[PDB]
Structures are given as structure tokens and as C-alpha cells.
Paper text:
The crystal structure of human PRCP was determined using MIRAS phasing techniques at 2.8 Å resolution by analyzing native, mercury and platinum-derivatized crystals. Interpretation of heavy-atom positions and resultant electron-density maps show that the asymmetric unit contains one molecule of PRCP with an unusually high solvent content of 82%. The final refined model consists of residues 46-348 and 353-491, five N-linked glycans, and four disulfide bridges (residues 215-372, 233-310, 264-343 and 364-394). Clear evidence of covalently attached and ordered saccharide is observed at the other five canonical glycosylation sites. The overall architecture of PRCP consists of two main structural entities: an α/β hydrolase domain and a novel SKS domain. The first part of the insertion (residues 194-334) consists of five helices packed into a novel helical bundle (the SKS domain) that caps the active site. The catalytic triad consisting of Ser 179, Asp 430 and His 455 can be identified based on structural similarity with other hydrolases. An unanticipated feature of the PRCP active site is an apparent charge-relay system that links the catalytic histidine (His 455) with His 456 and Arg 460. Structural alignments strongly suggest that the hydrophobic pocket in PRCP, formed by Trp 432, Trp 459, Met 183 and Met 369 is functionally equivalent to the S1 binding sites of PEP and DPP4. The binding of known substrates by PRCP that are cleaved at the C-terminus requires access to the long substrate binding groove of PRCP.
PRCP is a lysosomal, serine carboxypeptidase that cleaves hydrophobic C-terminal amino acids adjacent to proline. The S28 family of peptidases consists of two enzymes, PRCP and DPP7. PRCP contains an α/β hydrolase domain harboring the catalytic Asp-His-Ser triad and a novel helical structural domain that caps the active site. PRCP was originally discovered as an angiotensinase and has since been implicated in vasodilatory, proinflammatory, and metabolic pathways.
Residue numbers in the entry:
A (entry chain B), B (entry chain B): 46 to 348, 353 to 491
The structure:
């Protein structure tokens, strides 16, 4: 429904006394259904984008507001949306971006909760539950781990809190992406697997380069220096699809039908095919993701401040090891190269990744002492490879959604939602209301 | 006995990527009694001074090493001893002192534990227990709260983790100091209480100012501009004595006998006294603290890098509210003035205190979710006013030492140790071995 757009003055640096500069962090408040009379606060720990986007898309929060008689708070992450510490200069240099860390964001969330309990009459002694998806989920989980005095519990939806170092294998994500295509149709993964070598052949002559350009209906003519970028963009497509493999039609990044992988896997399916015919089928598949509603005239393989911030973060703290092997996946082999990644990070930002940091700060797998965190994960979501899929304790629990892609549980109810989601969404509220009840009884 | 002096390269900034500068943090290792064969690591979270000083004085650690078959680690706090990030320049400006926070110190401790488990063969899968006294105690407790993946538990000895904001009354510390003198002899507190007004009278004339100088055997002649400093120094004496009111003779800051308050309270005791005679008795009392072994010719009321660092910290994060009222204490009234304190901090360092910070970071009183922390406190220790004196849970436990001044429990055994200490020191090991056992059985 409707909310109020609010601003709160925040220190730029919570970890140092030298800078005294402030900035306004944007946040949203939805108060209908909230009962001052023994209710609760559902706090979304904002991630890598505009807070309105997360507000507009986390349906489960609005869907569960009345039942939990809650106030909804959506807190924007510093350096995203309108919550820029140095305004336009925020991405200027390594000096200006120094304050973009997960610790600074968690510290903003504590200051903001402090402010709401102080400001809103009735809030002062109410329980607050942290909710988040993807990095927002990692943030929500870490917020209960470090600030248990601020939040009673956390719902960490598709939060890959273990996608680091040697915790999980670098192959897993792409292995799951492959599994999605294989289980979505006969000879689908096999078709994609064979496609790379076929693109490589055609990349050899200028005539083949011209043919490829037309077959794929590209905007610009392919040169031989473009071939690695072309394959990267196609790989990026299959990846995207695995995260958006929803039980119903959707318009998140692109207009897409129900079970989009099943729809693309229809164009592949025939094994007895020529390399020329195989790439025509590949196009048809690309066409469903990029042009499902006649949206484009040609496919442009080339492709902002939200990606800039994420890039900085991926270059500093959030260093997730990724690789493909062509054996456990349908992709060409690519190893995880920390050294190479480090040098590109220094070139763009003038900073170097700390690949062990997150593990030293947030604990890695060693988190048994914590309580009240429900980790939900979809079976289709490649991100589940780096998440928690089995219960750590009676209070640190895992919830799997078979037929669930990237955090389906946080979406607005559809009709097409399998039992696995509704059943999980209910287990979520079950746990949330057990945290509120336990808080009020102490 | 004997230890090894070691150094470990540490990042200057753990909370930012802009600075890449490093420094060597000093640490000590005692390995006799340590069994690679299912033992433990007793880690002292270094506080506001030289690590050797803490090593030389935390007897309980060496006394319990064999029983817990442990390696002793003494980690120096950044900006103290030889662990200076910018060497001689470390205290230069507000820019250079930016990195002196409790979070940075806790982050150094995590990096150092990581290094020992990586470096020392056998350490890798052993349990580590954080030990600390005073601020070291606050640090040890906070280290289990934030890094439970690094330490199994903590022994927080005389750690005033609640000496902030409105958590406790600003009067408490000085109320306890008063109680120590009152219970240590008839008319002792009454004598000190009356002394202030008597010093004020004599401060009026130059003849009285001269008399006072001789009666107190001062080094420099008292002027009227010195009177507030004189009273401050005498107040500082009674304070010191309450923290060092030990059951046996000691030479920590000054050569002192057993129960030094009882010894000073002998010189007061007579109520039926003149103001002139009262100040002669006050001197006799000052004489036991400053000259018990003929150490000085005169008492110098005027009085370093360890105080500088502590001053910075007390000006930034560790902002503990203090006051005297003359009703619940034996002192002249002085209110807690945050505004005044803030301006003096800006004048000396160019920084302003954040009086609510520690509470937002470490949780204040709201710490029930944490586990395995034993808070010991002495009954005489004025610092116990801001500490934990009753059990929060079965695992967050309080231990009181009647006849115990400032962290008596951490000292080397004497013979003169009351049952209350030995009984508490044993309950400490009881809990410590329950954390090691539980770790090994999982
Ligand atoms: C995107 O989808 C639409 C419709 O499927 C395509 O638009 C067609 O354009 C062709 C040639 O330019 C015309 O003959 C027709 O007007 C369109 N067909 C239909 C059925 O509407 C468009 O070319 C698609 N594919 C790509 C790669 O852009
Ligand atoms: C500190 O203690 C000693 C001993 O109690 C004092 O030294 C005395 O000095 C006086 C005068 O200067 C001499 O007559 C004697 O040599 C000392 N007496 C004894 C018993 O040794 C000293 O003055 C004390 N008090 C102060 C305030 O300094
Ligand atoms: C949010 O959705 C509303 C309508 O539901 C729309 O006006 C707006 O464009 C959306 N904003 C974002 C950032 O998605
Ligand atoms: C591929 O070819 C062979 C024989 O020509 C056949 O046995 C098999 O069923 C074929 N499959 C498809 C999907 O065409
Ligand atoms: C492709 O997309 C980018 C990104 O906005 C744009 O700047 C570029 O000019 C585009 N070219 C074509 C032919 O679509
Ligand atoms: C942390 O967990 C891991 C694997 O989950 C285990 O092997 C390890 O030894 C645990 N704890 C410590 C303190 O080393
Ligand atoms: C530590 O004690 C030893 C002897 O036990 C001594 O040589 C040294 O002066 C002491 N150092 C400190 C800093 O107290
Ligand atoms: C103080 O004086 C009175 C009478 O002169 C007496 O009752 C009381 O015991 C005295 N106490 C001391 C310690 O001199
Ligand atoms: C008093 O102590 C200080 C601190 O070291 C010193 O600088 C000063 O000159 C001293 N004066 C006397 C008379 O003791
Ligand atoms: C924190 O503890 C205090 C006093 O110890 C209590 O009144 C308070 O409401 C507690 N928790 C919250 C979340 O407000």
C-alpha cells in the first residue's frame, strides 16, 4: 500500500573520531496495522540499490504486517539511492569511498533503530525483527550476530553468508545453474555445453563472425576481440534465468513467462542438430529473456551507481570465489584468480581485496552460539550453494523451498505459489511470532 | 616464570580500505604446561599500558596454566608499549590517533588468534579463553560478545562494562570509596568529610596557605590558585587506596602495608579534634600512601604515553559519567558536566566524545543472549559500581569477592588470601574447564 519517506542524520564514520561529517540516510515507514498496544517492528536491512525498489518488491513484509501487527521500516544502505555520504562526490576517489563497508551499514541500522524507539511513541519497548534478501539477507543475519540487543531475530532470505574462501567449492553456483537447465528439459544443458565450441569455430573467419552477428541478431558487428565478451553475456543470461526461475510470469529486470528456463529449454531439446542450427536455437532462447514482449529490435551485448557501489564492495570485503570447470557444469573452464582480481580492483579503485576479512569479522561457519535466525533458500537459486541448508541449532534454522528460485518467499502471494513456499512462509511467521512472544514474556 | 617476546604485522585500519599501512603488535607466549595433546589457550586481551606489566602482574594466569594445560598469550593493545602504529608520530595529531578504538583492538586480537592457530602446530583446533582485568576485562567480555567464533568464553575481572550513561548512577564509585573508609575504622569517612571545609578556611590567608604547605610537607609553596588541585590530589589518594585495599603488603604503584585503608584510618579515628590537628592527621594518612618506606623528602602534588592514550580513549568512546554529592559520599559536591568535558577534549585532541556509542556497539545491559562470561568483582573495588554483580543467566555469571579490592582474583596466590578469593578463583577455573570440555565434545 502506502508509506512515508523519511531521513535521519548519520555520522559518516562510526569507527573513527577524526571525521565529524554527517549525511541523511533515507528510510521508509508503513504504520497501518502497527499496534502501539504490544506490536512489533519489521526492519528491512537495505542492500545494493534504491530502498523504494526493495520496498516495492518485498511483498511478504506487507503480506505479514497485519498478522504480526507491525510497523514496516525500510532502511537504505549508505552509498545507494539518496543515502550518499558525500553526495555526487561519493564515488570520486578511494578517500571518499573509504566509508562503504558492511560494518558502517550495520552501525547505521543500530543508530536508526535507537532513533525510532526514541522518536516514535510506543516503539520504545517493542521487539524488532531484521528482514533481508540476498546481500540484505547476509546483512540481516550479521545484524542479529553483532547487534542482538537491537534485533530479536532475523529472516535471512537467500543469504550466501558462506560464499567465501574455502567454506564452499568455487564451482557450486555454476553447478546449480547447470542443474536448473538439465532438470528443466531433455538435452538442455548438453545443448548449452556444446554451444561454446561452436561459437569458437565461427569466430575464426570474418565470414563466420558475420554469420554469428546475424544469427544472434546483434546490434554491432562482431570482431574477434568481442568473442570473449559475447560468451560472457550469454553465460550471464543463463545465470540471470536461474535466479528468476519463478512459478509465474514476472517483470523484475525483464518481461518473462512462468518457468522461463522450461520455455527456453523447448528451443534446445533436439540433440541431432548442426552447429549452425544449434546457434539458431541458442538465439531463440536468448530471445525469450531479452525480447519476450517485442521489447527490442536487436540484442546489444554491451551494458549504474548501484553497480559502482557493489563493485567497490566486491573489491574490498565481499570477495566471493567463483569458477567453472566444464565437468560439473555446462560452461567453459575458468579458474578463480585472486591475484588477477586484486590488480583490476587496484586499477579501478586503488584498493585491494581482503579475502579473509568477512570470515574473521562474521565467523564463517562457526556461528552455533547465535540464536533466532531463519535462513531460507530456494532449490533452484544458484546462491543457495553459499548459504545455510541444514539447521545449525533449534534456533539457527534452515528452510528449503523446492521449486524456489532467488528468495521466492519474500514475494507478494500469487496463486501459482507451490506448497513448499506457502509452507516455508508460514514457518517464517511461526518463528517470528515465537521471538516477539518470548521478548514480551521477559 | 619465562616467556617469548613476539611481533605480528597488523593492518592499521581494519574498518577501511583507503589506508594500507601496517605495524608490529607485540605479544608474549608462555608454552611450558601447554599440551598440544588436547590443551587450551589463555589469551590476555591487553589494555592501557605495557604488555610486560600485565604479564608480570596477572599471577592467576601462570597459577592456573598447568591445571588447564595451557599456553599463555599476552597481546599488547595498539598505541601502548611498543605496539605503536605510527611510531613516535602515533600521538602527533587527531589524524594519527584516528585508529585508537576498542573495535580496532578487538579486530587485532582476532587477527592475532587467526595467526597463532595457523602458525603454532597443535593450536589449530584448540579452545581459546579471553582473560582481562579493568579495561582488559571490558575488552575480554566484549571479545566473546562480538567474536564468539574466536574465544569459547571470557573471564572479565573487575570490568565496568556498565559504567556509562544512565546505566548506573554517577555517584556509585565515590559512594563505594566512602564505604571503604567508613567500614575500615570509626570516624574515618567523617574525618575526611570534614577536612575539605578546613582546607578551604586556611586557603583564605597567605599565613594559612603557608601553614598548610608545612603541615602537608609540600615541595612547592601553596598559592590560592593551587587549592583546587591540592584537594583533587588528596581525593585521588583516597581513590587509589580503595582500589589497592589488599589483604597483604604490595608494591604496585607504591610500597604499601596490608589493609592500607585500616592503617590510614588509625591516624584519623579521633572525632574530638581541631581543624589544625585534623589536617596533621590527614598528612599522616597521605604519608602512608606516598612515603611508607621513607621513599620521599616532600609530597609533590604535580604529576605518560599510557595516560595520553587513555586520555584519548576517555575523550572518544570510554566516556564514563562521574560525580560526588557530599551526601552519599565523603567528598565535596561535583556534578557530571558532559559539555565542559567535551570542550576540553576538543581543546587537547580536536575530537568530541560520543557518550552513547559503547552502549550502541556493545549493548549496555541488554546482553542476555550471550554465553560463557564470568564477571568477577571485589566488594571494596569502587569499579564494581559499574560492573555485573548478579547472574544474568546460567552462563553469564557474576562472582563477588568480599574483602576484594581491584581484581584481587588475578593476583599470584599469597597465604593471606581470604576464602572468598580462593573460592572465586576456583569457580573461575570450574567454568573455564567447562568451556574447554564442551568445545572438545563438539
Ligand atoms: C523481438 O520481438 C518482435 C516480435 O516477436 C520482433 O519484431 C518483428 O520485426 C520483424 C522484422 O524487423 C517484422 O517482420 C515484424 O514486425 C515483427 N514480428 C512480429 C511477430 O511482431 C523482433 O524482431 C524480435 N527479435 C529481435 C531479435 O529483435
Ligand atoms: C618520609 O619518611 C622518612 C622516615 O619516616 C622521613 O625522613 C626523616 O627525615 C627527617 C627530617 O628531614 C629526619 O630527622 C630523619 O632522618 C627521618 N626520620 C626517620 C624516622 O628515618 C621523611 O621526612 C618522611 N616524610 C615526608 C613527608 O617526607
Ligand atoms: C515503485 O512502484 C511504484 C508503483 O507501484 C512506481 O511508481 C515506481 O516507479 C517504483 N519505483 C522503483 C524504484 O521500483
Ligand atoms: C536422435 O537420432 C536417433 C536416430 O536418427 C534416435 O534414436 C533419437 O531418438 C533422436 N532424438 C531426437 C530428439 O531427435
Ligand atoms: C549499447 O548499450 C550502451 C549502454 O547504455 C550504450 O551506451 C551503447 O551506445 C549501445 N549501443 C547500441 C547499438 O545499442
Ligand atoms: C569451526 O568450524 C569448523 C568447520 O565448520 C571446524 O573444523 C573448526 O575447528 C571450528 N572451530 C574452531 C574454533 O577452530
Ligand atoms: C617485569 O618484572 C621483571 C622481574 O620480575 C623486571 O625485570 C621488569 O622491570 C618488569 N617490567 C615491568 C614493565 O613491570
Ligand atoms: C569525644 O568526647 C566525648 C566527651 O568529652 C566522649 O563521650 C567521646 O567518647 C569522645 N570520643 C573520643 C574518641 O575521644
Ligand atoms: C613535580 O613532578 C613533576 C613531574 O615529573 C616535575 O616535572 C616537577 O619539576 C616536580 N617538582 C618538584 C619540586 O618535585
Ligand atoms: C533492555 O534492558 C532494559 C533495562 O535493563 C529494559 O527496560 C529494555 O526495554 C531492554 N530491551 C529493549 C530491546 O528495549
Amino acid at each position: 500500500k502506502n508509506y512515508s519517506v523519511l531521513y535521519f542524520q548519520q555520522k559518516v564514520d562510526h569507527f573513527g573520531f577524526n571525521t565529524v561529517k554527517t549525511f541523511n540516510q533515507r528510510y521508509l515507514v508503513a504504520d497501518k496495522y502497527w499496534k502501539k498496544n504490544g506490536g512489533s517492528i519489521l526492519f528491512y536491512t537495505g542492500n545494493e540499490g534504491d530502498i523504494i525498489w526493495f520496498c516495492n518488491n518485498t511483498g511478504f513484509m506487507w503480506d505479514v504486517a497485519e498478522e504480526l501487527k507491525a510497523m514496516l521500516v525500510f532502511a537504505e544502505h549508505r552509498y545507494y539511492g539518496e543515502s550518499l555520504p558525500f553526495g555526487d562526490n561519493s564515488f570520486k576517489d578511494s578517500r571518499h569511498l573509504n566509508f562503504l563497508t558492511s560494518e558502517q551499514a550495520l552501525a547505521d541500522f543500530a543508530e536508526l533503530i535507537k532513533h525510532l524507539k526514541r522518536t516514535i511513541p510506543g516503539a520504545e519497548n517493542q521487539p524488532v525483527i531484521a528482514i533481508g534478501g540476498s546481500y540484505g539477507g547476509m546483512l540481516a543475519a550479521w545484524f542479529r550476530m553483532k547487534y542482538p540487543h537491537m534485533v530479536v531475530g532475523a529472516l535471512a532470505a537467500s543469504a550466501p553468508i558462506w560464499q567465501f574462501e574455502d567454506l564452499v567449492p568455487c564451482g557450486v553456483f555454476m553447478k546449480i545453474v547447470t542443474t536448473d537447465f538439465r532438470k528443466s528439459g531433455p538435452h538442455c544443458s548438453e545443448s548449452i555445453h556444446r554451444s561454446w565450441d561452436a561459437i569458437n569455430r565461427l569466430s575464426n573467419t570474418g565470414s563466420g563472425l558475420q554469420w554469428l552477428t546475424g544469427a544472434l541478431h546483434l546490434c554491432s558487428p562482431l570482431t574477434s576481440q568481442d568473442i570473449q565478451h559475447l560468451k560472457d553475456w550469454i553465460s550471464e543470461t543463463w545465470v540471470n534465468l536461474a535466479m528468476v526461475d519463478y512459478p509465474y510470469a514476472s517483470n523484475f529486470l525483464q518481461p518473462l513467462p512462468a518457468w522461463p528456463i522450461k520455455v527456453v529449454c523447448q528451443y534446445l531439446k533436439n540433440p541431432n542438430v548442426s552447429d549452425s542450427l544449434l546457434l539458431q536455437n541458442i538465439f531463440q532462447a536468448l530471445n525469450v529473456y531479452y525480447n519476450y514482449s517485442g521489447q527490442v529490435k536487436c540484442l546489444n551485448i554491451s551494458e549504474s551507481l548501484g553497480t559502482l557501489g557493489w563493485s567497490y564492495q566486491a573489491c574490498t570485503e565481499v570477495v566471493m570465489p567463483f569458477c567453472t570447470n566444464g565437468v560439473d557444469d555446462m560452461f567453459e573452464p575458468h579458474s578463480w584468480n585472486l591475484k588477477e582480481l586484486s590488480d583490476d580492483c587496484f586499477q579501478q579503485w586503488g584498493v585491494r581485496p581482503r579475502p579473509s576479512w568477512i570470515t574473521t569479522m562474521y565467523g564463517g561457519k562457526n556461528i552455533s552460539s547465535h540464536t533466532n535466525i531463519v535462513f531460507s533458500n530456494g532449490e533452484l537459486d544458484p546462491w543457495s550453494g553459499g548459504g545455510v541448508t541444514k539447521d545449525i541449532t533449534d534456533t539457527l534454522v534452515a528452510v528449503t523451498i523446492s521449486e524456489g528460485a532467488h528468495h521466492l518467499d519474500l514475494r507478494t502471494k500469487n496463486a501459482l505459489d507451490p506448497m513448499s513456499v506457502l509452507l516455508a512462509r508460514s514457518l517464517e511467521v511461526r518463528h517470528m511470532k515465537n521471538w516477539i512472544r518470548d521478548f514480551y514474556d521477559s
